[PDB]
């Protein structure tokens, strides 16, 4: 008289916190609760009331034949740090599994537009051993943190949490037994560019702009020597930035500004020497005090395509 | 007086990511799954269907005489982080071991 239909599992995910982004590894940490509910065969409980079984005691019930399927985080890195866990067994057959978890999760993250980047933090959940003929997800609900003021937070959550329930078919695996039910949660976020605009981009602009002042010096010697102090100032600034900003395998927006600075100061050095060593006149072409910042900003504009 | 042939083990390895290179230590992290499949002793299973034995229930089957040989990563540095693991036990003696690892 068995029931061979798939077991419908309802899932709720409570996300406490997302943090600890690691840019090079493209990972992030998630702390929260996972709640899974399904209906089994009815049972007798003490006093015909719901029965609570915590932590180690859960293992005793699995040994007695209680079915408690393992649900794997597909995109977790290593074994997640599972805290308290609990089962609730109802007389009518309901079974609810609840667990606190902390894990590091991976996803495709693109930081090229840093510090103005947007990211999709994703949770992917799937049964470890049971295909969708035995265990299928029926619904997914996600509850996040109530935010007071976002100006203090590194990331700003734009929009409600998106969810999906799909099927994953594996070729490497009877017919119709190679398909697993998967839940996908997505939290869209946008970085807080404030800190990076005032402490990094703005001071770097004043530096590059300040380097354009070499054209206002009234001597070749003064123009060429001060340029070297400017160059030294961009290099000293590249260290300050690299020491704080995240490591990546590609350049960001700030990295390109720094390169633009190197190019500006190097270009000015070639112009200072050409003007002075092409003729014997020089001071008049050095009156490019306006032409240089425009050419930089001009190129600076076509870089934004 | 006739010896038994060796047990053949088919292996499938699934590599999720290779990251965390440490140049000085000449190491790197690898996250994935490993599947090993062999034929052992025939056995009875509920309804004669393939049986799924997950995680800590595997050790109960070992204590009662199920053979599960230890497969070692020769070039793993330290004990790898094992997540979920699973045995699929068939009546004809087939065993499929599936485990998540990070090392």
């Amino acid at each position, epitope marked *: 008289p068995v029931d061979a239909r798939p077991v419908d599992v309802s899932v709720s995910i409570f996300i406490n916190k997302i943090y600890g982004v690691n840019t090079l590894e493209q990972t992030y940490k998630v702390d929260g609760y996972i709640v899974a509910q399904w209906t089994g065969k009815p049972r007798k409980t003490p006093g015909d009331k719901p029965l609570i079984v915590e932590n180690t005691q859960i293992e005793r019930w699995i040994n007695n034949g209680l079915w408690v399927p393992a649900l794997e985080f597909i995109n977790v890195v290593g074994s997640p740090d599972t805290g308290n866990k609990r089962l609730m067994l109802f007389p009518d057959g309901r079974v609810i599994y609840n667990a606190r978890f902390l894990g590091s999760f991976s996803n495709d993250m693109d930081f090229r537009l840093f510090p103005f980047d947007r990211q999709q933090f994703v949770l992917e959940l799937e049964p470890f051993s049971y295909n969708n003929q035995q265990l299928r997800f029926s619904d997914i609900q996600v509850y996040t943190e109530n935010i007071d003021n976002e100006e203090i937070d590194e990331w700003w959550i734009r929009g409600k949490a998106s969810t*999906h329930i*799909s099927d*994953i*078919r594996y070729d490497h695996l009877q017919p119709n037994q190679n398909e697993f039910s998967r839940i996908t949660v997505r939290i869209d976020a946008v970085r807080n560019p404030s800190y990076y605009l005032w402490s990094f981009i703005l001071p770097l602009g004043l530096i590059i702009a300040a380097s354009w002042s070499v054209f206002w010096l009234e001597s070749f010697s003064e123009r060429l020597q001060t340029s070297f102090t400017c160059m030294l100032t961009v290099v000293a600034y590249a260290f300050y930035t690299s020491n704080i900003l995240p490591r990546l395998p590609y350049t960001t927006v700030i990295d390109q500004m720094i390169i633009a600075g190197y190019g500006s100061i190097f270009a000015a050095i070639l112009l200072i020497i050409f003007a002075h060593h092409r003729q014997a006149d020089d001071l008049l072409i050095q009156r490019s005090r306006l032409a240089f910042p425009l050419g930089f900003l001009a190129i600076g504009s076509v870089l934004v395509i | 007086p006739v010896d038994a042939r060796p047990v053949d083990v088919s292996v499938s390895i699934f590599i999720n990511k290779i990251y965390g290179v440490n140049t000085l230590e000449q190491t790197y992290k690898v996250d994935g799954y490993i599947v090993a499949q062999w034929t052992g002793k025939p056995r009875k299973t509920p309804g004669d269907k393939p049986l799924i034995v997950e995680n800590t229930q595997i050790e109960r089957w070992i204590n009662n005489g199920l053979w599960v040989p230890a497969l070692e990563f020769i070039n793993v540095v330290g004990s790898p982080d094992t997540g979920n693991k699973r045995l699929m036990l068939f009546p004809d003696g087939r065993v499929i071991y599936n485990a998540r690892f990070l090392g």
Partner: nanobody
Amino acid sequence: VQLQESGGGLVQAGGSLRLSCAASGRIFSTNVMGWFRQAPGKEREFVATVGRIGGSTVYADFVKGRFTLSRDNAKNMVYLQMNSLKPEDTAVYYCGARIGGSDRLAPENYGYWGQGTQVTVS
């Protein structure tokens, strides 16, 4: 990148079709292509695309094992073998290319859509 769908047409319940999407332009592979559909009045919804790990494929919940995604990286094409059709499947089946992000199931992460192929089940 330019995509062009093909293979649509009319069929009765329980029939079969084989859609094709030809990619022309700068594409790193066909892994980035995914099938979507949009019936009149309904949103454009995900149908299928390759999985992150080799040998895996992501299918919408309504597929129920009926459709099967395949690819010819040489010819730079992906195929969708649709079987056991039903009236509910009538829609315009587009072909998108994942433009980034980590939600293969999200149309917002796709672009370079094609003109679309009409499929109608009676």
